[PDB]
Amino acid sequence: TATLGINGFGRIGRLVLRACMERNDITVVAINDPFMDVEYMAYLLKYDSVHGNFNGTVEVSGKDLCINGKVVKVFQAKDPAEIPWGASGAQIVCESTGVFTTEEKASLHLKGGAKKVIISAPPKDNVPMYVMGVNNTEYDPSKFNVISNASCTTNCLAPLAKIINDKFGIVEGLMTTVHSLTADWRAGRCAGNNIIPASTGAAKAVGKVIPALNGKLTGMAIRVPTPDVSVVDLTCKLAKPASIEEIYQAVKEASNGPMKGIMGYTSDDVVSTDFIGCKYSSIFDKNACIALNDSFVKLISWYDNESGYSNRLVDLAVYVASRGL
Amino acid sequence: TATLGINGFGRIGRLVLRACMERNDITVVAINDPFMDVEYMAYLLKYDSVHGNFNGTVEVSGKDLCINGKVVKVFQAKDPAEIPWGASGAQIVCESTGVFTTEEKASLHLKGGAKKVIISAPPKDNVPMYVMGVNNTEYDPSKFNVISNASCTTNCLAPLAKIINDKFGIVEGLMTTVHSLTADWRAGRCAGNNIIPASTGAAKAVGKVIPALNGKLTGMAIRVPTPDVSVVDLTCKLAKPASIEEIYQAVKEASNGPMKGIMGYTSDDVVSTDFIGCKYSSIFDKNACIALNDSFVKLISWYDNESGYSNRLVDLAVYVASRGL
Amino acid sequence: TATLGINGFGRIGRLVLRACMERNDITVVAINDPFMDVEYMAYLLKYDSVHGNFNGTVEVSGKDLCINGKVVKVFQAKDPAEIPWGASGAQIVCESTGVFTTEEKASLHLKGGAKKVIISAPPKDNVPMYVMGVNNTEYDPSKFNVISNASCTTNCLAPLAKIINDKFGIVEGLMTTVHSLTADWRAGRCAGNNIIPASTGAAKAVGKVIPALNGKLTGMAIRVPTPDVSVVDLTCKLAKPASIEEIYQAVKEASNGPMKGIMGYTSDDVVSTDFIGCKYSSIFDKNACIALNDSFVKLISWYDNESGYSNRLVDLAVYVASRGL
Amino acid sequence: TATLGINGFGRIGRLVLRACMERNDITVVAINDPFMDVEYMAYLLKYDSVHGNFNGTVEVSGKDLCINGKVVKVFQAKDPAEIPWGASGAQIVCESTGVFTTEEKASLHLKGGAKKVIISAPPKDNVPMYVMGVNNTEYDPSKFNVISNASCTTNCLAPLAKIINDKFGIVEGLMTTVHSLTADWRAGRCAGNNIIPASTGAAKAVGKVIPALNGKLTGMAIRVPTPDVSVVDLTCKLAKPASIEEIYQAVKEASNGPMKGIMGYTSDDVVSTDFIGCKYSSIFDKNACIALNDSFVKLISWYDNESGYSNRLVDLAVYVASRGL
């Protein structure tokens, strides 16, 4: 059974733990964050404005945490190499501080006894990025000790882009993602009452996760005042004509097939809040989609930027473990 | 000087009046709304959560209103044919109830003495739509007594699409407009905390205002919880190659020339709120635009869905009067 | 098991139904609402922007609904006397349209075969009000067939006031309740952008539920843009001096005793969202309470204005049934 | 004409500059912020999500700014002791970084050539606090070089409390101020989605600004998701009986005479947004006030926590200058 260590007890780190506590194939054994006291960590785990109260009990034991009775070690080393991951028994480390997004820095965890490291964000260098259901099987334990689970936006676009490209072929595509606040001068403006244009490298990252799409996609983001749940607006030109119904069918096939639990779909009159807590990486909104003609369409896909991503990072760890440490 | 009568004292109707009070070439002489008491009309004109306090003085005079010293006649006739527009000295009627959107219904104002009617929305029938700066000069006074000022979304897309189509040619385009709340099962969901997919006929409406674009554009909308100001996200393929810089220069030219006051532009890192009160119909956001290549681009254009549209209606009323009643 | 009939399938009626589905001592057998098709009712029950997806299954069956394998009859009669409550086997009717708040109108449900009626709001007439945990045992089945569950605000203030008045005696009190949007010219102003002063008859209602406090309290409300969960701010002069600690202990005793499931308490650094879904009628916030001295204090108590109230109405229905229908 | 220097170009600092630019009795000469380039400063000054575009022109001239044809030296020292105020000619400094709130830290601005310093926040040490219209004349230029302009909340409560105490006498009072987001573990929770209990020392601070009220007032705050404008809810016991109408008259008298421009009043059905941009320190809402009896009342007063406070700081600067530098 895989054991996890979390560095950076932020939104992501906290959600990863919550996702583990609900699973029987992965256990969180230790957490590290030099900027959080044990009591504060407990408080932050027990209450959340988006995901509700923690499903279980959280208490402080000495210097550590006792979650649902299980003990979770709590460290505060500003240097990855000094985090007793090994003594803690943590085999895989979830690097979610957003400060060690390079093999160089992230690999320091191995010096702490860790066998593998997953950066919860795209890397600054060439660390391989993996998107569950899209290219995770390309991972080779005998070649990589530090990998990346890309970003929340990339995890929404990649699976949809892959299904579409595989079936009809994407000649070119432009994406706009409408981001909730949990998903540059503009960025500093009041988030509560503004629609804010922003940058996202998701479209390009998809080009890396899916080589065939390199140079064929690019996009931007638009931040809106909602707390959680985002949407991908992908308008692309198809190499082979196709209707929304056929696109819908191809997505349904993948969703019920090779991408079970990763790609989802709906034909209901849903809105943002209906996906809070949804574990899917990408949910196709059939009725929201529109097409000018059989080769120029606009696809809409939902994603709980927090839940989907966090659960994918856990799926990735579990998968890594399954490949042998 | 042109005189105006307003039917329906809602958000648009009130803003049209506030726009007129600023101008010396048109005056509001009568308002008709069978569902609002004058005291309440006074209240709604004096205070606004988006546009601030009314600039001036508003007082009830008997059953009428006294605005900045001028007597504005108030009526409550449910039948447009029975509104005394003629006796009141109102030449042009701003039909903004949203209930009389066909030539048959709107023309009833003419029986009340009005000489011309402008529907503050797209027609359900074939009433001609005019967009200032785009096709308003096609208006023929000897042929139409009832016209339409289209919609806020069309007034944003039309001028931008015209420019792009005139200089580079639009092969095909797909639009997404992020709508503020002042701009169906989904529509009824909580607006305050949801991103809500929605429909708009603006892309097709542009296909009539600009016949050349007929069949080459389509789109949808996405509603978010901001009080005012929306954005048009146009992704299109050009017939001739063009860089963002050249597209910017084209808009800049039109903006400083044939579309002054209508098409605008910026290269600053603006956000939603920066356009509150802006009178332009469409503002190109240079830095927000992105290009995949020289023939496939995504253009971003802001518009205060309330202020721009309301000022265009006044401009159209003034233009109508200049052509002879 | 008592059976419930629901008139008016709005926010309250829907949550009352979702609460019943969580219990075995009460069953919903029918719903009446002339302004909703069966399809729409299903959608509204399945999806919700505050309480999440319906915990279970919902399908349309002919003209009725099948909820978790159970048949719930659907009617659309505008006259309460025309609703076949009796024929549907519904014993108690939850009157939640907000339009039949008098015995005269509410009793019309009895003509349909219903035995008891509970108005989900304070009555416009002398219909008796009952607050679970405060005065519900005063209910006399031989004297009333129509009763009221008061209001969400009253259900939060009554239990707290009773405890304080009994233990220390309330000399006089002034209340301010901060209302979420689910809880007059100002009332019609932009909700998600304003702090809006408003009215509430809670204080006076409490003087009727607890006679001894009649004329000793009065309050007002302040509406804010949060979706759900409200707060009661009670500032009062006590007959007998007391510290916040003593007041807390007092509330604690009641909460663990005679007011179990009704009065709650906490000493954690909670915020609004931590109470979404909480079923208590009132939750004392120890750390938010402050005192100028031992006989002049300000008490802060939370309440999910939707969940607490709806569950109290179900509790009252169960109770009423236990007393002889 | 006094000269002002601004340290910390945040919301307050900027609004303080915008206020100075509208007056002829004071001139902004320099700005310092170790975290902003001159370009970023110009941007933050020209655009604002709450107060609209800058009223005038903003241009970067070398390393400095040219605001409305006037030169404004720009610095970026992280230490007050190293800011060259003298050179620029800055006589009085507006210390608005929120970090140097002690005489020890704040007095360093003098080393730079600055004669007087006004902290835009309640001090941590014994630096004197002044509220224009209440106790600013107590200022002694021969004994203070570093003073405080109190807080936004204190500037709302003090004037009201002074009027009420002078006329009827306040025996005891408890305050709750509903704070907009621009006005502890809870503090860190998502602001745009929660009602958050908070602390404020405003009530106790009033006891120092008005010694007679020492020990007679205390209060708390409740933060809500509105962009700007807050409210003071003062529940107090009076020494002499008084009706809401009489209290209103006393406020009116103070407002039209001795406290003009500071204390204001209204009897309209106002809401939050109606006060955006209001320069008053406190606005009595007549129709929102309520009373249990002639000696126990709840007073409601509004305040633009940004505009009022900022203009008061500028008033205080001009006043400090009149007293001889």
Q: What is the DSSP string of D52-67?
A: -S-SS-EEEETTEEEE
Nearest to C120 by CA among C4, C282, C198, C211: C4
User: Which residue type sits at D201?
Assistant: G
Partner residue facing A274 (CB), from C53, C193, C276:
C53
Total residue count of chain D as it appears in this document: 325
Q: Where are the domains of chain A?
A: 1-149+306-325, 150-305
Q: After which residue numbers is chain C interrupted with C–N beyond 2.5 angstroms?
A: 183
Q: Does B273 touch chain A (CB under 8 A)?
A: yes
Q: Shortest Cα distance from C53 to chain A (angstroms)? A: 7
* Residues in B touching A285 (Cβ below 8 Å): 197
What distance in Å separates residue C265's CA from the closest CA in chain A?
Answer: 16
Exposure class string for C204-232: b at 16+ Cβ within 10 A, else e: bbbbbbbeebeebbbbbbbbbbbbbbbbb
Can you tell me whether residue B211 is helix, strand or coil? Answer: helix
CATH C-level class of C1-149+306-325? alpha beta
B70 φ, ψ (degrees, to nearest 5): -85, 135
Q: Do D274 and B43 touch (CB under 8 A)?
A: no
Q: Does C290 touch chain D (CB under 8 A)?
A: yes
Amino acid at position D21, single letter: M
Give how far Cα A150 sits from Cα of A207, B96, B243, D149, Å: 12, 50, 30, 49
Cα B14 off chain centre by: 13
Q: Are D43 and B269 in contact (CB under 8 A)?
A: yes
C8: closest CA among C99, C97, C78?
C97
Residue A278 a catalytic site member: no
Q: What is d(CA D105, CA D107) in angstroms, rounded to the nearest whole number?
A: 6
Number of C/D CB contacts below 8 angstroms equals 135
Q: D221 — phi, psi (to 5°)? A: -130, 155
Tokens of D148: 């405080």
Is the torsion defined by CA of C84, C88, C92, C97 positive or negative? negative
Q: Does D273 touch chain A (CB under 8 A)?
A: no
Considering only CB atoms, D274 lies closest to which of B47, B193, B277, namely B47
Count the neighbouring beta carbons within 10 Å of the beta carbon of residue D137: 11
Burial (CB count within 10 angstroms: exposed 0-12, middle 13-18, buried 19+), residue C310: buried
- Rounded CA-CA distance A270/C5 in Å is 28
User: How many Cβ atoms from other residues are within 10 Å of residue D313's Cβ?
Assistant: 27
Tell me: is residue A53 an annotated ligand-binding position.
no
What is the resolution of the experimental data for this entry, in Å? 2.2
Per annotation, catalytic residue among A20, A66, A94, A152: A152
Phi, psi of B161 (to 5 degrees): -60, -40
Contact A99/A13 with Cβ under 8 angstroms? no
- Please state, as a whole number, how many other Cβ atoms lie within 10 Å of the Cβ of residue A261: 14
Indicate the helix (H) or strand (E) that contains D301: strand D296-303
Query: Is residue A304 a contact partner of residue A228, using CB atoms and an 8 Å limit?
Result: yes
| Overall residue count recorded for chain B in this entry | 325
CB contact under 8 A, B233 and A237: no
Q: Find, among B223, B229, B231, the residue nearest to B196 by Cα.
A: B223
Measured in residues, chain A has a length of: 325
Would you tell me which residues 194-233 of chain A have a C-beta closer than 8 angstroms to some C-beta of chain D? 194, 225, 227
CATH of domain C150-305: 3.30.360.10
H/E element, A217: strand A217-223
Does the CB of B285 have a partner CB in chain A at under 8 Å? yes
| Separation of alpha carbons C111 and C273, rounded Å | 42
Q: Cβ separation of A174 and B235 shorter than 8 Å?
A: yes
Disruptive mutation site among D193, D224, D226 for chain A (greatest number of A CBs within 10 Å): D193
Residue B192 at interface with chain C, using a CB cutoff of 8 Å: yes
Half-sphere exposure of D128 (CA within 13 A, CB side): 19
Query: Is residue C172 less than 8 Å (CB to CB) from chain A?
Result: no
Of D88, D93, D48, D97, nearest in space to D64 by CA:
D88
Contact indicator for D217, D225 with CB cutoff of 8 Å: no
Measured between CB atoms, which of C47, C185, C193 is closest to B227? Answer: C193
Binding residues of D for NAD(+): 11-12, 33, 78, 120, 305
Q: Is C268's CB within 8 Å of A49's CB?
A: no
Q: Is A39 helix (H, G, I), strand (E, B) or coil?
A: helix
Euclidean distance between CA atoms D94 and D118, whole angstroms: 5
- Mode of pairing for the β-strands spanning A116-119 and A146-148: parallel
Q: How far apart are CA C139 and CA A18, in angstroms?
A: 46
* Full 3-state SS string of chain C: CEEEEEECCCHHHHHHHHHHCCCCCEEEEEEECCCCCHHHHHHHHHCCCCCCCCCCCEEEECCEEEECCEEEEEECCCCHHHCCCCCCCCCEEEECCCCCCCHHHHCHHHHCCCCEEEECCCCCCCCCECCCCCCHHHCCCCCCCEEECCCHHHHHHHHHHHHHHHHCCEEEEEEEEEECCCCCCHHHCCHHHCCEEECCCHHHHHHHHCHHHCCCEEEEEEECCCCCCEEEEEEEEECCCCCHHHHHHHHHHHHHCCCCCCEEEECCCCCHHHHCCCCCCEEEEHHHCEEEECCEEEEEEEECCCHHHHHHHHHHHHHHHHCCC
**Beta carbons of B273 and D53 less than 8 Å apart:** no
Closest alpha carbon to C119 in C80, C87, C158 = C80
**Burial bucket for residue B142 (CB in 10 Å: 0-12, 13-18, 19+):** exposed
Answer yes or no: do A269 and B184 touch at CB < 8 A.
yes
Q: Which of D43, D195, D226, D274 to mutate to test the interface with B (most CBs of B within 10 A)?
A: D274
Establish whether C18 is an annotated binding residue: no
Tokens 């020209």 found at: D46
Backbone phi and psi for residue A205, each to the nearest 5 degrees, phi listed first: -60, -35
Identify how the structure was determined.
Answer: X-ray
Interface test with B, best of D49, D59, D229, D302 (most B CBs within 10 A): D49
* CA pair distance D94, D20, nearest whole angstrom: 11
Q: Which C residues 18-77 touch B at CB under 8 Å?
A: 40, 43, 47, 49-50
